[PDB]
């Protein structure tokens, strides 16, 4: 229903998150699409992954994958 | 050897425009569908035309990263 524009994207991701700074939720999303490229982290990255509480964490991961389950189900339906 | 130029290569590949390959663009999607963050024409123009059933099986490692990443945090003390 929305788009984005790609200057409009790239504006929002910054160096910082490189380092693992951020929220939780956007930081449990880049460490997961790093994952899935199996990309590996950078020390900052890293050292948040050891940081981070592991209830919210693990509240935020289930989350993903519930969404990759929505995709699922869109893609098969098709 | 790297996290920034492997990163730094895929945005050059024009994967915020949907090129790339289909694990790479898979992985930007849910990304964004993480976040709800609206994605750009080119990724939501490549989101119909992916061939479902190669796009499903990739889904499905993710599925299972997703819950390695839920075992790792169990595993920690």
Redesign the interface.
Known sequence: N?????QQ??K?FSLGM?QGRGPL??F??????????T????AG?LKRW?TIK?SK??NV?????K??????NI??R?
């Open positions: 929305r788009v984005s524009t790609v994207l790239t929002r490189l939720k956007l449990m999303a880049l460490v997961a699409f790093l994952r899935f490229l990309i590996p982290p950078t990255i050891g592991k964490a693990i991961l289930r989350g993903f994958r969404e990759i389950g929505r995709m699922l893609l098969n098709r």
